[PDB]
Design brief:
Chain C: This is Fructokinase-like 1, chloroplastic. Chain C: Belongs to the carbohydrate kinase PfkB family. Chain C: It is found in: Plastid, Chloroplast. This is part of a larger assembly, with chains A (63 residues), B (73 residues) and C (382 residues). Helix content of chain A is 6%, strand content 19%. Chain A has one helix and three strands. Chain A has one helix spanning 30-33, and strands at residues 2-3, 9-14, 25-28. With 73 residues, chain B is mainly alpha-helical. Chain B has two helices and no strands. Chain B is flat. Chain C is an alpha/beta fold and 382 residues long. In chain C, helix 2 packs across helix 9, helix 9 (314-328) packs antiparallel against helix 11 (344-352) and helix 11 (344-352) packs across helix 12 (366-376). In chain C, the strands form two sheets. Chain C has a nine-stranded mixed β-sheet, with helices on both faces. Classes of the chains: A mainly beta (63), B mainly alpha (73), C alpha/beta (382). At the A-C interface, loops of A face helix 12 of C.
């Protein structure tokens, strides 16, 4: 945790995007946290179809 | 006499639980198409964490003395 | 050379010809992103997002031999080392892990990993260097070739680094001739050194003699597009339709895993070839055979352990697993189903090899590789 601007606690998260910007880690604040889908799973699962449809637990909104 | 078992149940020797003298197969139950969508086994095996058998200890001993003749699996 | 009484041991031996080195990364290009020139505490952020050529960077041939023997196989290494402390410790490291060193030659004329060059200031002020005295590793002559490893070994594996020195060119070609005379296959690994990344035509001229003698060839995704067309295969990858997608997958903007057709790799194909392997890291392996071709699907995960992830040495593990399964199962050559099933072991080994720091420190075991293969792949695949 880190005290960011405006006295808000921030936490690091790795952004997943198909651009490979430069630094893929961001410091998210609580206001920007609940509108993203934050996975906590793994890529070690392969089915007869495609790997991109595998299911992992996440945290969207407050569920 | 007493069957082809020699009634291994009566003695206690290793023997299949079911009788290997009837073992009547299934009578062609409903296939995947004629089933409601909740029981379908969706024709593409799904990855699951519980897909490899638990290692366990007694599964090692059972395999260990199956080779030495003390066990008939 | 005919001296033998009893038949050879069960796992066929593998011939590993090249240079013995510690933690060497041959394939170097210009990475777009750099992470601070001084603070090395943040350099690990370049292992989560590799520069697309160091995604699965291969290394020396000793690394491949060690990974192969650690996977349950048997390997032997041909090379030369100096009579130094470093030279005496490299052979100790190789010996500690059951790598046969019957073909490693010790000499005192040259020093291990040390080569004497000379400054040759040219026009303008651009300095140059000319190799005055060669390093110990690249100083093997054809006379001191162990004519027992070559006879016994069933696969001859070498990398392109030996094509950058004059004497090893002749020595390698003599060894290839001997091994082919004794009936062994030739495995070619294309871990291109830095000078060979200059131009396509020069590299193709350099490697043509070695390429035409190979029975199995393994190249990366960049080492194939470079050898055919970099601009075309980079324009094709980054392309999205102006109006509407085509099928549906194109409407999801997923990653580009292109399976090259047999008419595009035809310039790199010849009659003697038995297999062509193109590895897109550990993600996918495209295999091309004389009568069939296909792609084996895999995955990767370095964010599972962001602090102990180091991609170096994974390509060596992939190649070693490929060789181990090639020698263990001789029916993979003409059976596509068996080929696909046995090519996931290499993917599992490559996945495991990226979870630790150090090329030789954390090469996976056979049991661990099988465990990961069975845990990632559905029972129908494995």
């Amino acid at each position: 945790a880190r005290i960011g601007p405006w006295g808000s606690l921030e936490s690091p998260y790795y952004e997943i995007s198909e651009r490979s910007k430069r630094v893929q880690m961001l410091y998210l604040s609580p206001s920007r946290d609940e509108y993203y889908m934050l996975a906590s799973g793994n890529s070690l699962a392969l089915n007869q179809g495609i790997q991109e449809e595998q299911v992992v637990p996440a945290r969207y909104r407050q569920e | 006499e007493l069957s082809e078992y020699e009634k291994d149940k009566k003695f206690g020797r290793p023997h299949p639980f079911v009788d290997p003298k009837v073992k009547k197969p299934i009578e062609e139950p409903l296939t995947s198409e004629e089933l409601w969508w909740n029981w379908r086994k969706p024709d593409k095996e799904q990855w699951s964490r519980w897909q490899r058998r638990k290692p366990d200890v007694e599964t090692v001993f059972l395999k260990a003395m199956a080779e030495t003749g003390q066990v008939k699996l | 050379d005919d001296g033998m009484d009893f038949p050879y041991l069960d796992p066929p031996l593998i011939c590993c010809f090249g240079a013995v080195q510690k933690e060497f990364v041959p394939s170097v290009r210009v990475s777009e992103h750099q992470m601070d020139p001084d603070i090395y505490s943040g350099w690990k952020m370049m292992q989560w997002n590799p520069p697309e050529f160091g995604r699965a960077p291969g290394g020396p041939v000793s690394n491949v031999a060690i990974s192969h023997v650690r996977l349950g196989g048997r390997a032997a290494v041909i090379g030369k080392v100096g009579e130094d402390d470093f030279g005496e410790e490299l052979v100790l490291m190789m010996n500690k892990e059951n790598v046969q060193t019957r073909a490693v030659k010790f000499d005192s004329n040259v020093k291990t990993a040390c080569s004497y060059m000379r400054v040759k200031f040219s026009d303008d002020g651009k300095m140059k260097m000319e190799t005055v005295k060669e390093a110990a590793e690249d100083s093997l002559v054809a006379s001191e070739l162990n004519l027992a490893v070559l006879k016994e070994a069933r696969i001859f594996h070498f990398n392109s680094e030996v094509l950058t020195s004059p004497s090893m060119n002749t020595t390698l070609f003599r060894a290839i001739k001997l091994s082919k005379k004794f009936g062994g296959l030739v495995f070619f690994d294309l871990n291109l050194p830095l000078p060979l990344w200059k131009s396509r035509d020069e590299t193709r001229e350099v490697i043509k003699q070695a390429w035409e003698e190979a029975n199995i060839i393994e190249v990366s995704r960049e080492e194939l597009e470079f050898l055919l067309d970099e601009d075309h295969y980079e324009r094709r990858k980054n392309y999205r339709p102006q109006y509407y997608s085509e099928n549906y997958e194109q409407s999801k903007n997923r990653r580009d895993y292109y399976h090259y057709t047999r008419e595009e790799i035809s310039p790199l194909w010849h009659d003697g070839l038995k297999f062509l392997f193109v590895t897109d890291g550990t993600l996918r392996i495209h295999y091309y055979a004389p009568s069939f071709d296909g792609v084996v699907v895999g995955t990767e995960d370095v964010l599972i352990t962001p602090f102990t992830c180091d991609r170096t040495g994974s390509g060596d593990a992939v190649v070693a697993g490929i060789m181990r399964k090639l020698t263990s199962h001789p029916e993979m050559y003409e059976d596509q189903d068996v080929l696909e099933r046995q090519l996931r072991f290499s993917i599992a080994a490559g996945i495991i090899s990226q979870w630790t720091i150090g090329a030789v420190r954390g090469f996976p075991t056979e049991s661990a590789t099988q465990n990961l293969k069975e845990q990632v792949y559905v029972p129908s695949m494995w």
